[PDB]
């Protein structure tokens, strides 16, 4: 009905750096916006009301003003309990319409993951089943990979990459590798290994198994 | 305390109907508005209804209009939305918030957020199994063990390490869909390698439209 047109989508910006969030009405709204940041998996929370105005409670750095039809969330300081999806919402009429959101990355010092290898349960070989887990643990950047050379095979069938969301206090992400295999696959082979080379390493470092 | 406790989402066969249902503590509903708003999973906050509790008066996204009804009950302080006819788009968290009493038009108070899963797929429980933390896993110290939620529909399971004791370095993995159409995640928790043989490590998984509750152990061998 009224847009609000939210950029940048996407962001990362290290502590203390200086973050302006634009969201620019296709009318004219008033003073009628407000500014929400909504955590992982959690609910929406009010951070600006009445465009400029702070939520009691909300930090300083968090701040809000208006140009007529653009709006500017900026936070002087930024935190890395920052790390969000920040929202503008227009109100002045029906609906409620809210910019596409803007989702904060905090940038840190390049930390290499924590690989571990895990074999499948006896109750898991007793389901009839065989899934493998490779996990790399509190790792920045986000970009690597986790080859399985499974009696030295590289099989791309198999492969799910479930990574954790920026911590709120380090910003390392984690990473799960998970090798979908039947029991039947898995009943033949017994030596297994899964490698990773990241930003963090000089060397791809493999973590490998073999069944006793 | 000025809280919102959602209930009614689960898993709905598509066509199908489903309630949810708003609590409304430490404020009365007829002095404000309620709302209903949905966020479709990795997709934005999309408002979807409000009402006016003592009037009964209510406007309506169209996106749902005519097949979605938002009510409420001032007797239990309580609001509703009947939603039928439901299409996979409909599939996403539903969000009721307020509107702060008079002449404060914004969000201050939102629940958190009850799953609506607009799909046919039956509701399959998950299995647990623990994990290993053998001489492939140790830091030589600083080692790790788990569990991992292996098969189930719909979204989403509840874990707990130890029920809610165990906190640091828990890191449960977002659910991967598997080839199935069955969820897998894999709870995870870093410990000393001396302590494998301390204290009890049990992740809970709990998931809730298959009022599944498996207390799993991690044992190193």
């Known amino acids: 009905d009224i847009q609000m047109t939210q950029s940048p989508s996407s962001l990362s910006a290290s502590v203390c750096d200086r973050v302006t969030i634009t969201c620019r009405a296709s009318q004219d709204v008033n003073t009628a916006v407000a500014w929400y940041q909504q955590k992982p998996g959690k609910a929406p929370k009010l951070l600006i009301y009445?465009?400029?105005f702070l939520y009691s409670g909300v930090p300083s750095r968090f701040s809000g003003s208006r140009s007529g039809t653009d709006f500017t969330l900026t936070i002087s300081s930024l935190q890395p309990e920052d790390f969000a999806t920040y929202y503008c919402?227009?109100?002045?009429?029906?609906?409620?319409?809210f910019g596409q959101g803007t989702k904060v990355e905090i940038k840190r010092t390049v930390a290499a993951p924590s690989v571990f290898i895990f074999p499948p349960s006896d109750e898991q070989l007793k389901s009839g089943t065989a899934s493998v887990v490779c996990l790399l643990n509190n790792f920045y950047p986000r970009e690597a990979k986790v080859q399985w050379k499974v009696d030295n095979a590289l099989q791309s069938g198999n492969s799910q990459e479930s990574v954790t969301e920026q911590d709120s206090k380090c910003s390392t992400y984690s990473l799960s590798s998970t090798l979908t295999l039947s029991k039947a696959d898995y009943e033949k082979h017994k030596v297994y290994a899964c490698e990773v080379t990241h930003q963090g390493l000089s060397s791809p470092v493999t973590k490998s198994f073999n069944r006793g | 305390e000025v809280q919102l406790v959602e209930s009614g989402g689960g898993l709905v066969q598509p066509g199908g109907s489903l309630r949810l249902s708003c609590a409304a503590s430490g404020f009365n509903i007829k002095d404000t508005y309620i709302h209903w708003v949905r966020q479709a999973p990795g997709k934005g906050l999309e408002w979807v209804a409000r009402i006016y509790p003592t009037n009964g008066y209510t406007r309506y996204a169209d996106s749902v209009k005519g097949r979605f009804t938002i009510s409420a009950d001032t007797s239990k302080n309580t609001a509703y939305l009947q939603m039928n006819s439901l299409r996979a788009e409909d599939t996403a968290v539903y969000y009721c918030?307020?509107?702060?009493?008079?002449?404060?038009?914004?969000?201050?108070?939102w629940g958190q957020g009850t799953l609506v899963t607009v799909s046919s797929a039956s509701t399959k429980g998950p299995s647990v199994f623990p994990l290993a933390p053998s001489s492939k896993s140790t830091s030589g110290g600083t080692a790790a063990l788990g569990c991992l939620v292996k098969d189930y529909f719909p979204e989403p399971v509840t874990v707990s390490w130890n029920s809610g004791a165990l906190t640091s370095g828990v890191h449960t993995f977002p659910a991967v869909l598997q080839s199935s159409g069955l969820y897998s995640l894999s709870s995870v928790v870093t410990v000393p390698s001396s302590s494998l043989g301390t204290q009890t490590y049990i992740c809970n998984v709990n998931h809730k439209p298959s009022n599944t509750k498996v207390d799993k152990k991690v044992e190193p061998k």
């Open positions: 918030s307020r509107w702060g009493g008079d002449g404060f038009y914004a969000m201050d108070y």
């Open positions: 009445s465009a400029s």
């Open positions: 919402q227009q109100h002045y009429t029906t609906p409620p319409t």
